[PDB]
Amino acid sequence: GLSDGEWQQVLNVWGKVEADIAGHGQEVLIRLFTGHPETLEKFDKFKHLKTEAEMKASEDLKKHGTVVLTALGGILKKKGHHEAELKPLAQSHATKHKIPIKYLEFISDAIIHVLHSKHPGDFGADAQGAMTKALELFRNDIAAKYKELGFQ
C-alpha cells in the first residue's frame, strides 16, 4: 500500500545503492552481524569472522551482500507485485535457513542505518518514510508465508 509518489522515492533512493551495490551490501551485513551476533551464527561460512576487520576484509561477505541487495532491488522494482519473487525466499529462509522474522526486522533497520551513514543529509525524511514502508511491505508479505508454513 505505497502511493505512486512513495514508490518513486523508494526507487530514487535505491539508485544510490546501485552505484555501489557491494559496498552497501557489505555495510548492511556488517551492521546486522555486529548489532546482532546471533545472525552471524546462521551462516556456517561467516562464523569464522571474529572481528569487524575480518568481516571488512572478507570478499565472500561482500559477495553475499551483492546477492542479497540484488534480490531486494529486484523485489522493490516490482512495487509490491512481488509474490513470485517472495515465495522462494520465504521458503528458503523459513524452512532451510531457519531465519526468524525478527532477523528480517533487524536487517531492515540496518538498511535504513546504512543509507544515513553513507548518504548523510541526502536521505530526507520523506525518503526514509517511503523506504521504511517498502521494507515493512516486504516483511509483512514474508510473514504471511511464514505463518502458512507454521514457522517460528
UniProtKB/Swiss-Prot annotation:
Its main location: cytoplasm. GO terms for cellular component: sarcoplasm. It catalyses: Fe(III)-heme b-[protein] + nitric oxide + H2O = Fe(II)-heme b-[protein] + nitrite + 2 H(+); H2O2 + AH2 = A + 2 H2O. It is found in: Cytoplasm, Sarcoplasm. Pfam families: Globin. It comes from the Eukaryota. Residues 1-147 form the Globin domain. Its EC number is 1.7.-.-, 1.11.1.-. PROSITE patterns: GLOBIN (PS01033). Nitrite binds at H64. O2 binds at H64. Heme b binds at H93. GO terms for biological process: oxygen transport; removal of superoxide radicals. Keywords: Cytoplasm, Heme, Iron, Metal-binding, Muscle protein, Oxidoreductase, Oxygen transport, Phosphoprotein, Transport. The modification Phosphoserine is found at S3. The keyword Transport applies. SUPFAM superfamilies: Globin-like. One of its GO terms (molecular function) is heme binding. The keyword Cytoplasm applies. Monomeric. Monomeric heme protein which primary function is to store oxygen and facilitate its diffusion within muscle tissues. Reversibly binds oxygen through a pentacoordinated heme iron and enables its timely and efficient release as needed during periods of heightened demand. Depending on the oxidative conditions of tissues and cells, and in addition to its ability to bind oxygen, it also has a nitrite reductase activity whereby it regulates the production of bioactive nitric oxide. Belongs to the globin family. This is Myoglobin. It comes from Equus caballus (Horse). The lineage of its organism: Eukaryota, Metazoa, Chordata, Craniata, Vertebrata.
